[PDB]
């Protein structure tokens, strides 16, 4: 797989509440958020790859409510958002259950959902399918961790979940919805 450090900084908020993101040095970033709408912040790559290995270390992981410490990315053709969720806050991300995949010392549940009239890389009010791998139990944080994304791509394919042909961003993110928290993450 590719061996390139990060080149992309993502800082998205729909404007609800407070999302105080810091674009740190190298692969490092932090977020403190409060009473938010929908947001996603992270570091990664402008063009995703199905062969990338993402390394990270979350030195601070302190979400509440809906929060996700997750690989986040998109394809176009078709427009699909995907997620590999290693940890979360109060509520565990789920959807339509498809199966499981083992990767990087964890077992992940595979889900699909669909969003309507929602923000995406194509506009503020769009419809798109979402593919999820969600760890069955929260991954420990504070030590170096790996996501071998190809294992997820392959398992998704085995359940009829095919990604699009045009790769957009691919980041190791802090995402949340209607919540509050803190994170500090370094990505490579």
Numbering used by the authors: -2 to 185
Authors' account:
Fentanyl is a potent agonist of the μ-opioid receptor (MOR), with an affinity of approximately 1 nM and a potency 100-times that of morphine. Custom-designed ligand-binding proteins offer the possibility of both detecting and counteracting toxins such as fentanyl. Following the placement of the hydrated fentanyl into the binding pocket via PatchDock, RosettaDesign introduced 9 mutations to the Fen49 scaffold to optimize the protein–ligand interactions. Fen49 was designed to bind a solvated fentanyl.
We solved an atomic resolution (1.00 Å) X-ray crystal structure of Fen49 in the apo state, one of the first examples of an original (non-optimized) computational design that has been structurally characterized. The structure reveals a highly preorganized binding cavity (28 of 30 non-alanine/non-glycine side chains within ~8Å of fentanyl adopt the designed rotamer) and an overall structure in very close agreement with the design model; the r.m.s.d. of the design model to the parent structure is 0.26 over 184 of 185 residues (TM_align score of 0.99). The Fen49 apo crystals were obtained from a condition containing 25% polyethylene glycol (PEG) 3350 as the precipitant. During model building, a well-ordered portion of PEG was observed in the binding cavity. Soaking experiments with fentanyl tended to crack the crystals and destroy X-ray diffraction, likely as a result of PEG being displaced from the binding cavity. This, coupled with a lack of alternate crystal forms, prevented us from obtaining a structure of the parent Fen49-fentanyl complex. The Tyr80–chloride interaction observed in Fen49* is mimicked by a Tyr80-PEG hydrogen bond in the Fen49 parent structure. Purified Fen49 displayed an affinity of 6.9 μM for a fentanyl-Alexa-488 conjugate by fluorescence polarization.
